[PDB]
Scaffold this active site. Structure first.
Site, mmCIF file in Angstrom:
data_model
loop_
_atom_site.group_PDB
_atom_site.id
_atom_site.type_symbol
_atom_site.label_atom_id
_atom_site.label_comp_id
_atom_site.label_asym_id
_atom_site.label_seq_id
_atom_site.Cartn_x
_atom_site.Cartn_y
_atom_site.Cartn_z
ATOM 1 C CE1 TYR A 21 3.227 3.524 -0.343
ATOM 2 C CE2 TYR A 21 3.705 5.381 -0.286
ATOM 3 C CZ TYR A 21 3.192 4.788 -1.042
ATOM 4 O OH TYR A 21 2.400 4.586 -2.242
ATOM 5 C CG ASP A 65 7.552 7.329 -8.816
ATOM 6 O OD1 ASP A 65 7.703 6.802 -9.993
ATOM 7 O OD2 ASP A 65 6.270 7.329 -8.784
HETATM 8 C C1 LIG Z 1 -3.467 0.318 -5.736
HETATM 9 O O1 LIG Z 1 -3.009 -0.093 -4.801
HETATM 10 C C2 LIG Z 1 -3.087 -1.367 -4.430
HETATM 11 C C3 LIG Z 1 -2.063 -2.189 -4.093
HETATM 12 C C4 LIG Z 1 -0.296 -1.623 -4.986
HETATM 13 C C5 LIG Z 1 -0.387 -1.638 -6.358
HETATM 14 C C6 LIG Z 1 0.085 0.198 -3.886
HETATM 15 C C7 LIG Z 1 0.341 -0.486 -2.690
HETATM 16 C C8 LIG Z 1 2.236 -0.603 -2.353
HETATM 17 C C9 LIG Z 1 -0.219 -0.436 -1.795
HETATM 18 C C10 LIG Z 1 -0.144 -0.716 -0.189
HETATM 19 C C11 LIG Z 1 -0.505 -0.006 1.575
HETATM 20 C C12 LIG Z 1 -0.402 1.547 1.514
HETATM 21 O O2 LIG Z 1 -1.149 1.771 2.725
HETATM 22 C C13 LIG Z 1 -0.552 2.095 3.280
HETATM 23 O O3 LIG Z 1 1.131 1.600 2.953
HETATM 24 N N1 LIG Z 1 -0.908 2.668 3.818
HETATM 25 C C14 LIG Z 1 -0.050 3.154 5.428
HETATM 26 C C15 LIG Z 1 -0.293 3.571 6.760
HETATM 27 C C16 LIG Z 1 -1.697 2.537 7.042
HETATM 28 C C17 LIG Z 1 -2.536 2.875 8.148
HETATM 29 C C18 LIG Z 1 -1.778 4.176 8.901
HETATM 30 C C19 LIG Z 1 -0.775 4.807 8.502
HETATM 31 C C20 LIG Z 1 -0.654 4.216 7.380
HETATM 32 C C21 LIG Z 1 -0.675 -2.291 0.388
HETATM 33 O O4 LIG Z 1 -0.938 -2.991 0.915
HETATM 34 C C22 LIG Z 1 1.060 -2.728 0.157
HETATM 35 C C23 LIG Z 1 0.623 -4.757 -0.184
HETATM 36 O O5 LIG Z 1 1.819 -5.519 -0.267
HETATM 37 C C24 LIG Z 1 -0.484 -4.854 -1.873
HETATM 38 C C25 LIG Z 1 0.612 -4.969 -3.374
HETATM 39 C C26 LIG Z 1 -1.038 -6.137 -1.482
HETATM 40 C C27 LIG Z 1 -1.724 -6.205 -0.606
HETATM 41 C C28 LIG Z 1 -3.105 -5.493 -0.213
HETATM 42 C C29 LIG Z 1 -1.088 -7.667 0.452
HETATM 43 C C30 LIG Z 1 -2.533 -7.383 1.728
HETATM 44 C C31 LIG Z 1 -1.631 -7.530 2.538
HETATM 45 C C32 LIG Z 1 -2.118 -7.405 4.509
HETATM 46 C C33 LIG Z 1 -2.889 -9.258 4.374
HETATM 47 O O6 LIG Z 1 -3.330 -9.877 5.227
HETATM 48 C C34 LIG Z 1 -2.503 -9.262 3.069
HETATM 49 O O7 LIG Z 1 -3.166 -11.469 2.889
HETATM 50 C C35 LIG Z 1 -4.429 -11.738 2.067
HETATM 51 C C36 LIG Z 1 -2.605 -9.069 1.350
HETATM 52 O O8 LIG Z 1 -1.664 -6.540 -2.964
HETATM 53 C C37 LIG Z 1 -0.942 -8.127 -3.594
HETATM 54 O O9 LIG Z 1 -0.981 -8.912 -2.636
HETATM 55 C C38 LIG Z 1 -1.754 -8.225 -4.637
HETATM 56 C C39 LIG Z 1 -0.968 -8.502 -5.808
HETATM 57 C C40 LIG Z 1 0.013 -7.090 -5.964
HETATM 58 C C41 LIG Z 1 -0.927 -6.009 -6.859
HETATM 59 C C42 LIG Z 1 -2.075 -5.771 -5.756
HETATM 60 N N2 LIG Z 1 -2.528 -6.997 -5.474
HETATM 61 C C43 LIG Z 1 -4.041 -7.106 -5.482
HETATM 62 O O10 LIG Z 1 -4.751 -7.510 -4.845
HETATM 63 C C44 LIG Z 1 -4.912 -6.032 -5.786
HETATM 64 O O11 LIG Z 1 -4.557 -5.627 -6.804
HETATM 65 C C45 LIG Z 1 -5.426 -4.834 -4.866
HETATM 66 O O12 LIG Z 1 -6.353 -4.028 -5.398
HETATM 67 O O13 LIG Z 1 -3.797 -3.585 -5.350
HETATM 68 C C46 LIG Z 1 -3.989 -2.497 -4.096
HETATM 69 C C47 LIG Z 1 -4.339 -3.129 -3.167
HETATM 70 O O14 LIG Z 1 -4.424 -1.430 -2.199
HETATM 71 C C48 LIG Z 1 -3.918 -2.064 -0.508
HETATM 72 C C49 LIG Z 1 -5.349 -3.310 -2.446
HETATM 73 C C50 LIG Z 1 -5.706 -5.281 -3.685
HETATM 74 C C51 LIG Z 1 -6.736 -5.238 -3.440
#
Ligand SMILES: CO[C@H]1C[C@@H](C)C/C(C)=C/[C@@H](CCOC(=O)NCc2ccccc2)C(=O)C[C@H](O)[C@@H](C)[C@@H](/C(C)=C/[C@@H]2CC[C@@H](O)[C@H](OC)C2)OC(=O)[C@@H]2CCCCN2C(=O)C(=O)[C@]2(O)O[C@H]1[C@@H](OC)C[C@H]2C
Lengths: 107, 107
Positions: B82, B37
């Site tokens: 991540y 990226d």
């Molecule tokens: C600014 O980050 C955003 C998400 C991505 C743009 C960035 C990203 C790749 C974050 C990773 C964490 C990156 O962080 C790490 O990987 N950290 C690594 C690490 C962690 C701990 C120890 C060591 C290392 C992530 O959480 C991926 C996840 O797939 C996102 C895209 C997804 C979510 C929150 C899904 C949850 C997942 C859990 C399920 O239970 C739940 O069910 C309801 C759905 O998010 C979503 O499903 C939805 C739809 C897509 C946009 C994101 N989204 C949102 O609801 C949001 O707008 C939100 O605000 O988007 C941010 C999220 O942050 C966690 C929180 C969330 C409320």
């Protein structure tokens, strides 16, 4: 469930398949109108693999019905989103979410 | 953690604080050199706010140590990025990331 309302139409022919990378710009708002997140504010599209990336159910179902270039508003009920717990520090318990999503490109 | 190594110095006194927006240009590489990226390729600076819970830990803790104008190499272990999940199809599981970052301004 999720409601999809088009703001701008896409091409109507190219829809996301599983295993494809969707590149979107999104703004997330709570039903009350408080914006809690936006990729547009970071100047960086969110890229995810449809089917592989763990996303809330409403997002997966909603983006799946969008064609490339479309901008749409997804209104997602809490059971299709973070349900009863919310997501600490960002989404409250039982929240309905409104996403303004633009499907920019499929890779 | 995050290792910050200076490529060229900043002013040595204006450091990012919680609630400020960092405006940066960066290129991100996996530690084998593969680029995944870059904001330069989108021709827009990447922006994020400290304290807003919207970037991986390595960005917040890495940029917090930089002064305005500084260019630095940040090496981020998987637990500050991540982790074990990666970002499917972009970042592999357990990836150390390398960023070449320039802190352009705070707002
Ligand atoms: C600014 O980050 C955003 C998400 C991505 C743009 C960035 C990203 C790749 C974050 C990773 C964490 C990156 O962080 C790490 O990987 N950290 C690594 C690490 C962690 C701990 C120890 C060591 C290392 C992530 O959480 C991926 C996840 O797939 C996102 C895209 C997804 C979510 C929150 C899904 C949850 C997942 C859990 C399920 O239970 C739940 O069910 C309801 C759905 O998010 C979503 O499903 C939805 C739809 C897509 C946009 C994101 N989204 C949102 O609801 C949001 O707008 C939100 O605000 O988007 C941010 C999220 O942050 C966690 C929180 C969330 C409320």
């Amino acid at each position: 469930g999720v409601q999809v309302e088009t703001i701008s139409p896409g091409d109507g022919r190219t829809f996301p398949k599983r295993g494809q990378t969707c590149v979107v710009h999104y703004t997330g708002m709570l039903e009350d109108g408080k914006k809690f997140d936006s990729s547009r504010d970071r100047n960086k599209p969110f890229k995810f693999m449809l089917g592989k990336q763990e996303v809330i159910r409403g997002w997966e179902e909603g983006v799946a019905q969008m064609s490339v270039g479309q901008r749409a508003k997804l209104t997602i009920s809490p059971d299709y989103a973070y349900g009863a717990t919310g997501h600490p520090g960002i989404i409250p318990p039982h929240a309905t979410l409104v996403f303004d999503v633009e499907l920019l490109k499929l890779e």
